[PDB]
């Protein structure tokens, strides 16, 4: 338990200036066995409630240079997103909504901005959006801002820049949701903000008819609840 | 030959069904042999194109930016050389209209002789954008354990860089190989390994006789040539290189471009 | 007799053998989207654009048809390159060779060597 406080102390006063020295302190203090605890602590107690200090943690991951630890962090993030998504969607869970938004931002920062993909066996985004549309109005509030946050970091990826087929695949679905007359002004303005951030034109996109395929929407894989 | 239980044709109908068995097959069987069928070379470059490597790159670029893919064959193997218990080659067939597309009649004619169905390609064919969208979130591309294998893959890796980025290829080779390294990190090229070998020279079929390998399928196709590429590499590495492919010299390079 | 098309950025020049090549007509793409015709070599006359037909896309298509001796209800293999250039799929200095009938040059050795990976 004494070590448990040292990890918190190390993460508390992190700065760009002392990043290397604090990394050395952490490598000296924490063991190999206790690394999963640090991964869960960083993704559950530090990243997900503090959206302002995110570049610091990405730089910490880069400086540490531990692919096993990076995989542990990514897996814990995916598990947390799944737990939040497949939960009782209470209409007043603003804390949960912010939690999901911040975790999605972190996911987009540590996968898309690192020129790595979001694996389908771990999380599918287009199917998530279609299921959100088919389930009702509550799940859209959870999904559309989360997907916008994930795609926000695509502009910093030379692989996942707008002309990427996958990014346009997600963006055309979001454009359809934008065109939907039953969607709310909040979600519509969020989609427009994402389009501005990616420097696209909502009028220049190529929306399809994915929301009109009842047969496809019936047999969707269930990542929600 | 056997092109039924070892080679699976992927149309636009069974694309998501046969892409589900690729994600679950790439996890344990990582090496992917690659072949691409395309309508040939049709446009020549002009200018102050010295640096025969640079000339080769521009000859690649001028043709890739205008011609459209017609077939892509992938074969899955593990380190030792075993195959994934049944279907191990996928032959993706794309869209191609023989009346409103770009082609050279000396390539289309012999491909039609080989057996490609240009009436079926027009109706049931995979759209490149959809294929790329399914490819990015599959783990086949952009991963680190996947080690691609190919034979004289100048145009093979350019057509899919265009397909996977939906943009024209970069002007110089510096920005082409940089993005190729991000997409496919390991580019073991059998021909580059060949131009270090004692006697092995020629083409694919002219070396499949020297290596004593039997071709499974029909010639000049995509799926039945990726299998021969894979078997050729797993014989060359075993026999000449003493079970080692040195990363520094023979990896990440192509024939002509490197 | 052979024909050639040179795409030097904004200029699409069509030329005929006479391997010296004499240009017949050149299309210039203006600032935004305008297309201009510069029939040359004979420098005017001879090949005559018919009445009515005035648009640059149509004059160039008719001239290519008259050069290739092709049928009216035909989109020949030079017409396809013209259309690709106008639509903007040829944005670089490039060279396209053709026979008299309009298809790309027959290159059996290159095709056979490029399909056998030689
Ligand atoms: Mg081939």
Author numbering:
A (entry chain B): 1093 to 1317
B (entry chain C): 6 to 263
C (entry chain A): 1 to 18, 26 to 125
Text lifted from the article:
Here, we reveal a unique mechanism by which the Legionella effector PieF perturbs host mRNA decay by targeting the human CCR4–NOT deadenylase complex. High-resolution cryo-electron microscopy structures and biochemical analyses reveal that PieF binds with nanomolar affinity to the NOT7 and NOT8 catalytic subunits of CCR4–NOT, obstructing RNA access and displacing a catalytic Mg²⁺ ion from the active site.
We determined the cryo-EM structure of the NOT1:NOT8:PieF ternary complex at 3.5 Å resolution to further elucidate paralog-specific differences in PieF-mediated deadenylase inhibition. The resulting model includes the same NOT1 and PieF residues as in the NOT7 complex, while NOT8 is nearly complete, missing only the first five and last 29 residues (V6–G263 out of 292). NOT8 associates with NOT1 in a manner nearly identical to NOT7 closely matching previously determined structures, suggesting that PieF does not prevent the incorporation of the inhibited deadenylase into the CCR4-NOT complex. The structures of the NOT7 and NOT8 are nearly identical, with a few notable differences. NOT8 residues do not contact S99PieF and G100PieF. At the same time, T98PieF interacts with the R173NOT8 (N173NOT7), which additionally interacts with the carbonyl group of K96PieF, a contact absent in the NOT7 structure. Although highly similar, NOT7 and NOT8 exhibit their main structural and sequence divergence beyond residue 265—a region likely flexible and unresolved in either cryo-EM structure. The measured dissociation constant (Kd) values for NOT7 and NOT8 were ~24 nM, indicating high-affinity binding.
